[PDB]
Amino acid sequence: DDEINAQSVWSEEISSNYPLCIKNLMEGLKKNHHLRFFGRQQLSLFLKGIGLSADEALKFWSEAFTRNGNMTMEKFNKEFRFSFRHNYGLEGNRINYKPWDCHTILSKPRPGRGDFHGCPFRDWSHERLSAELRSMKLTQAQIISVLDSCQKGEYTIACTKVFEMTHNIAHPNLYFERSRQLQK
Ligand code: SF4
Secondary structure, eight states, X not given: OOXXXXXXXXXXXXXXXXXXXXXXXXXXXXXXSOOOHHHHHHHHHHHHHTTOOHHHHHHHHHHHHSGGGSSOHHHHHHHTHHHHHHHHTTTSOOOOOOOOOHHHHHHSOOOOTTOOOSOHHHHSOHHHHHXXXXXXXXXXXXXXXXXXXXXXXXXXXXXXXHHHHHOOOOOHHHHHHHHHHTTO
16 A cells, blocks of 8 residues: 555656556546446456556545546446445455457457547557657657557557666556566
8 A cells, every 4th residue: 555545646747657558548538537348347457457446446436536526426326336346356246357358358358439439559540649658758869769669560669668668478467567576
């Protein structure tokens, strides 16, 4: 709880370790105060994979869904609380909900309008990727190298390139713990 909790996952320090997909999901949750089923599972199981406790997860999801008066606490407890508790097995279920790897993430149905699951290196446009990479302090030479892998369909190589360029197999939780390891 000292490192990963409901408040510290919104921190810049912790969130600077997220791969592009989790960053995309967190951003959609912050502005819409809600995520769809596929996006819910991708992000929820990742946070569980980095050590977010059951109590902190329910604190995290409840505040996020009810933020800015998006929905009441009663609507959340009646329409979403069970599903999040289900993912941690707090209702007695013994389904093995492991965090999704990149292969599993890319295999899900592709995101449409309003969806935030998936992998940005395949689902975003080159224009959207380029602007996002520039805010991450990448130069156009580095950008053209990442888009090259994207155009070739090697999305895990493009994400591995971003890691090396932003720092000094194929799993989003492996991205986090490698990056978070370089912080300590
Ligand atoms: S390669 Fe995997 S970890 Fe990286 S952005 Fe795509 S789905 Fe996320």
